[PDB]
Amino acid sequence: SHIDCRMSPWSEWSQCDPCLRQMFRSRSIEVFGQFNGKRCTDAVGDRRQCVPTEPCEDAEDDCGNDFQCSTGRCIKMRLRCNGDNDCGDFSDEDDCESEPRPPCRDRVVEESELARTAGYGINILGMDPLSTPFDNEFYNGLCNRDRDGNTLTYYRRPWNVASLIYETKGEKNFRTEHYEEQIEAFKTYQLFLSYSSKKEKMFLHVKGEIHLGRFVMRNRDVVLTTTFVDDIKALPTTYEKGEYFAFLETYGTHYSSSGSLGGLYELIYVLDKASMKRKGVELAVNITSENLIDDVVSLIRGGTRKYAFELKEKLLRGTVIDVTDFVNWASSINDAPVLISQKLSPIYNLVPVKMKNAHLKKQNLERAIEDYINEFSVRKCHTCQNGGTVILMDGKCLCACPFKFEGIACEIS
Amino acid sequence: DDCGNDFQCSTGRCIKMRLRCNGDNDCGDFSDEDDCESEPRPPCRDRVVEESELARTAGYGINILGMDPLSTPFDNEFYNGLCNRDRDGNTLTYYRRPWNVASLIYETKGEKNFRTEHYEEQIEAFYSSKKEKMFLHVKGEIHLGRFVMRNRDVVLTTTFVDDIKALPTTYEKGEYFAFLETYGTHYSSSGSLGGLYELIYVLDKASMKRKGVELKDIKRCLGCVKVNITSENLIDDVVSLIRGGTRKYAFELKEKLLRGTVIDVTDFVNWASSINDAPVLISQKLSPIYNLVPVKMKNAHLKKQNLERAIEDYINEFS
Ligand SMILES: *[C@@H]1O[C@H](CO)[C@@H](O)[C@H](O)[C@H]1NC(C)=O
Ligand SMILES: *[C@@H]1O[C@H](CO)[C@@H](O)[C@H](O)[C@H]1NC(C)=O
Ligand SMILES: *[C@@H]1O[C@H](CO)[C@@H](O)[C@H](O)[C@@H]1O
Ligand SMILES: [Ca+2]
Numbered sequence: 001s002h003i004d005c006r007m008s009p010w011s012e013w014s015q016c017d018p019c020l021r022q023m024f025r026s027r028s029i030e031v032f033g034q035f036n037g038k039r040c041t042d043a044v045g046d047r048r049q050c051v052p053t054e055p056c057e058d059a060e061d062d063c064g065n066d067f068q069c070s071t072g073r074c075i076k077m078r079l080r081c082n083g084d085n086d087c088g089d090f091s092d093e094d095d096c097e098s099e100p101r102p103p104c105r106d107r108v109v110e111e112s113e114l115a116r117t118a119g120y121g122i123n124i125l126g127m128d129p130l131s132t133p134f135d136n137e138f139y140n141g142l143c144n145r146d147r148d149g150n151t152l153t154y155y156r157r158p159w160n161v162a163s164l165i166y167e168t169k170g171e172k173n174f175r176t177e178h179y180e181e182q183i184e185a186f187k188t189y190q191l192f193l194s195y196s197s198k199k200e201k202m203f204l205h206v207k208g209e210i211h212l213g214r215f216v217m218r219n220r221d222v223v224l225t226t227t228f229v230d231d232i233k234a235l236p237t238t239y240e241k242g243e244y245f246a247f248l249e250t251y252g253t254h255y256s257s258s259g260s261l262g263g264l265y266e267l268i269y270v271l272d273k274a275s276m277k278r279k280g281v282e283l284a285v286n287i288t289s290e291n292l293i294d295d296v297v298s299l300i301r302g303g304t305r306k307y308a309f310e311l312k313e314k315l316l317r318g319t320v321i322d323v324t325d326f327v328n329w330a331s332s333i334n335d336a337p338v339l340i341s342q343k344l345s346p347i348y349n350l351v352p353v354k355m356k357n358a359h360l361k362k363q364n365l366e367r368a369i370e371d372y373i374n375e376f377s378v379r380k381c382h383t384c385q386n387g388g389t390v391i392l393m394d395g396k397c398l399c400a401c402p403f404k405f406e407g408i409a410c411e412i413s
Numbered sequence: 414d415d416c417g418n419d420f421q422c423s424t425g426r427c428i429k430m431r432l433r434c435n436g437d438n439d440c441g442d443f444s445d446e447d448d449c450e451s452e453p454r455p456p457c458r459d460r461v462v463e464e465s466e467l468a469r470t471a472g473y474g475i476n477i478l479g480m481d482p483l484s485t486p487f488d489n490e491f492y493n494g495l496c497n498r499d500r501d502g503n504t505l506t507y508y509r510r511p512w513n514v515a516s517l518i519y520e521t522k523g524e525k526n527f528r529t530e531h532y533e534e535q536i537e538a539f540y541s542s543k544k545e546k547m548f549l550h551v552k553g554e555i556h557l558g559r560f561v562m563r564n565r566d567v568v569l570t571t572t573f574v575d576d577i578k579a580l581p582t583t584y585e586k587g588e589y590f591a592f593l594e595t596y597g598t599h600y601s602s603s604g605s606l607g608g609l610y611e612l613i614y615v616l617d618k619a620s621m622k623r624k625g626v627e628l629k630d631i632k633r634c635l636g637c638v639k640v641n642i643t644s645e646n647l648i649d650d651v652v653s654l655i656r657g658g659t660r661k662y663a664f665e666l667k668e669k670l671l672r673g674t675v676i677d678v679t680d681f682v683n684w685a686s687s688i689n690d691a692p693v694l695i696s697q698k699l700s701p702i703y704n705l706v707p708v709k710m711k712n713a714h715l716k717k718q719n720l721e722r723a724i725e726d727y728i729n730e731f732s
């Protein structure tokens with residue numbers, strides 16, 4: 001029969017966290033739902049208000065002679081007045097009635113529209129990008145002007161983006177592979193048998209990888225977003241799974257410590273086709289089968305709307321593609337890049353030392369991320385039949401099979 | 414309630430003192446922005462930005478058992494006085510991100526498929542058996558951007574928390590079902606803005622293929638001499654599902670299909686250009702709405718526990 005969402009009992013509640021003015025509760029997921037039963041939508045934990053059972057400790061975490069900004073954030077005095085968006089929000093106008101001097105002197109430099117997005121959060125579940133933990137509109141008083149980028153225009157590189165180098169690389173891989181076959185035979189009162197069979201196989205693989213450089217994030221002196229540091233300040237300090245999962249679900253299990261920008265296209269045709277016949281009379285019989293799979297798939301990512309969706313389908317069809325259609329799509333990757341692949345750093349590496357209780361939060365995050373990877377596992381689900389495998393999705397385990405066996409568990413043929 | 418040193422709001426909210434003067438509608442109908450005209454200090458230092466129409470509707474309510482208002486309990490007019498921004502690579506326009514939405518990533522990611530599997534078998538002796546299974550699929554995705562939204566520090570519409578302050582402490586099933594349809598049964602904590610199609614050909618190929626068309630020719634005519642297939646009555650049984658875009662281009666694609674004719678590649682790109690106006694959600698990750706009920710609510714855990722007792726009854730209220 002079909003399969004429903006299931007969970008443990010809830011655990012015993014927390015004490016009241018005196019400065020956070022809340023209490024916390026949590027529960028384990030045990031079945032997601034499957035085979036089109038009752039799909040999960042169900043939470044890992046819950047929180048309740050309390051008048052706290054003890055005093056809160058002194059909140060302020062002041063860095064000293066550094067300027068304490070209107071954000072959660074400290075900054076060094078060379079950046080108190082710098083003609084720039086220092087310290088994570090504008091916080092300076094009442095001081096900077098003098099000393100306007102910019103990082104870039106007499107110049108007109110623009111922001112790198114790639115570097116602002118560098119250091120995506122990533123969730124290891126599905127490997128979706130999330131907006132940066134990193135500030136990337138902070139420049140540390142450095143001008144650090146790059147003339148780089150294929151559109152021959154200068155930009156200012158933001159402090160956390162240690163490298164952004166436009167290594168252009170364009171690759172195409174193409175493979176075709178056919179094997180094609182036929183076998184046939186033949187052999188008052190009379191006898192005969194006639195036999196024939198034919199097989200056709202094609203595998204095409206194509207991929208085109210187009211780079212727009214690579215970013216490497218800085219491994220010391222990282223300046224983080226006001227929202228992220230605040231979302232680390234507002235933590236239980238006691239390993240409440242559901243509350244830590246709420247931070248993973250807004251900034252990722254990892255961040256891309258370095259990532260490769262650009263675009264990709266990929267195409268497959270697989271065709272695998274067979275027909276078999278026998279006929280005979282012996283002093284009538286006539287016995288046949290046909291088996292075909294035909295599956296063509298196209299992926300395009302990166303570039304602008306028009307060119308990508310043109311090229312996506314032109315390439316899927318029989319069409320002999322115009323080189324200038326490729327040039328347009330591949331040029332538009334300048335305007336609209338996508339993250340091709342990247343190196344992942346566990347997110348707790350961005351819990352800054354020189355914040356209160358930092359190392360306790362890190363060991364909690366390290367445990368919590370391990371739990372977040374465990375109770376979302378596929379290994380708990382019931383088995384697929386025949387040649388399929390257990391796919392995982394939010395609130396369902398399932399399988400599907402382009403192989404003449406059928407249903408949401410591939411059980412029938 | 415009192416907001417301490419910060420400002421108390423009409424229809425019930427607390428706005429941090431630095432927000433009030435900024436231009437950002439912090440307390441609804443610009444009622445934050447009674448006189449501060451000596452210090453009207455903006456969130457953005459004269460930088461050009463236009464508000465994100467895709468994301469202003471993000472965080473739609475959804476119900477498995479009689480569909481929800483497709484509307485936001487979240488207040489996507491709120492920005493915490495930040496200027497943080499995501500931009501359209503297609504028109505090179507910057508948008509502010511509503512502070513509910515933890516991430517916008519505009520990601521041009523088209524995918525497409527065409528597929529058939531077919532089996533036939535016959536055994537005959539003048540025991541016997543005969544079998545068919547056949548289909549043709551065309552499937553497509555158009556993807557405009559990911560959204561993901563907060564699980565804490567959420568700022569709701571005042572009209573949503575009002576609809577919690579009006580709930581009784583008791584289970585009151587009729588009133589709790591009124592709320593659970595007034596805003597939603599569940600919310601997408603994340604989703605995928607775009608458009609989608611599925612155009613299954615229920616046509617068994619032999620229905621035409623006994624007349625002068627080959628398998629490679631009918632595939633050629635779909636995406637041809639050997640008959641005039643576009644003139645002929647022969648193509649009939651094609652389904653249409655089509656999600657998002659401007660109704661003209663959705664109609665043109667449907668009209669061509671119900672006429673038994675192929676859509677031109679010109680058409681699909683025209684449709685894909687129009688998903689910028691009128692997006693739909695291709696997939697969603699779901700949580701029940703009680704997770705939005707603020708921890709400050711005067712019987713908060715009791716109301717949330719009764720919303721769980723109410724959500725549980727919808728599954729029995731319908732077959
Ligand atoms: C028998 O022969 C006919 C004529 O070629 C063929 O169409 C059919 O598939 C064969 N199989 C049967 C009738 O079992
Ligand atoms: C096939 O018939 C249609 C009318 O249904 C006609 O417009 C078309 O010209 C014929 N063949 C061609 C040229 O497509
Ligand atoms: C944990 O589950 C218990 C059921 O034993 C409830 O009382 C509570 O609301 C929480 O969900
Ligand atoms: Ca300054």
Ligand SMILES: [Ca+2]
Nearest residue numbers: 432433435437
């Ligand atoms: Ca305001």
